[PDB]
């Protein structure tokens, strides 16, 4: 009976182990473009990824992780709402079993693919496990996919998948560059929030990109062939792995654009 996301164990179980689950600043949320509002104070966003270190990728059985160097600023998240600098220390994604679906945060109610969280933590804290303890430890880069035309810098990942099919399974994966997972824009809106997963920790400080990047169908297909599952049991197929919405409890969004 570990959590997951499916009819029993899915996100409508989860506050009975994580009772944070229906705390004041969960996420995702609906990001209401009307009511959101421009916030000139909003220093300029800095994406400084020139000098990242992939090591490795992981099907952890709720998503696959791409794991970084964190160990020194190599590649990091800076101004916007953010104070100092927060380390990159791994990529990953949701998605749907249907392109009408698969992103957490949603824009106006509208739900994309899938969608792209850099997970990054305040360098104050030292490392990711302290600074899960702290109100501003986290920084999420969230960004949007749609299905258009292929992203060529996905393609790596893509291809690896093979490899890590079920849960457990890793796999090598250096000089991948996150780089070529950005959209030409940084335009964002930004709030206090939560992870997505258990624990549910009210840690983060999101940042959700307003442009989306664009994947081909053959490439989030390869996505809906990963298992939730470990190597030899029956196969649930790794789709739908979405937190939806929750309640905005009165939190303010802000934009970086007027
Ligand atoms: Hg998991
Ligand atoms: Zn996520």
Redesign the pocket.
């Given at each position: 009976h570990h959590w997951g996301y499916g009819k029993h164990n899915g996100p409508e179980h989860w506050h009975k182990d994580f009772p944070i689950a229906k705390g004041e600043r969960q996420s995702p949320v609906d990001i209401d473009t009307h009511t959101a509002k421009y916030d000139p104070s909003l220093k300029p966003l800095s994406v400084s990824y020139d000098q990242a270190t992939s090591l490795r990728i992981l099907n952890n059985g709720h998503?696959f992780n791409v794991e970084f160097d964190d160990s020194q600023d190599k590649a990091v998240l800076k101004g916007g709402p953010l104070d100092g600098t927060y380390r990159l220390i791994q990529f990953?994604?949701?998605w749907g079993s249907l392109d009408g679906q698969g992103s957490?945060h949603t824009v106006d109610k509208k739900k994309y693919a899938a969608?792209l969280?850099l997970?990054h933590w305040n360098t104050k804290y030292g490392d990711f496990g302290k600074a899960v303890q702290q109100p501003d430890g986290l920084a999420?880069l969230?960004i949007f996919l749609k299905v258009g035309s292929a992203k060529p810098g996905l393609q790596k990942v893509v291809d690896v998948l093979d490899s890590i099919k079920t849960k457990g399974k890793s796999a090598d994966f250096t000089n991948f560059d996150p780089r070529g997972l950005l959209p030409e824009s940084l335009d964002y809106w930004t709030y206090p929030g939560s992870?997505?997963?258990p624990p549910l920790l009210e840690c983060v400080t999101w940042i959700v990109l307003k442009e989306p990047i664009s994947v081909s169908s053959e490439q989030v297909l390869k996505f809906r062939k990963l298992n939730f599952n470990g190597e030899g049991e029956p196969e649930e197929l790794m789709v739908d792995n979405w937190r939806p919405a929750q309640p905005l409890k009165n939190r303010q969004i802000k934009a970086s654009f007027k």
């Open positions: 998503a990953h994604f949701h957490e969608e969280h997970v999420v969230g992870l997505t997963t």
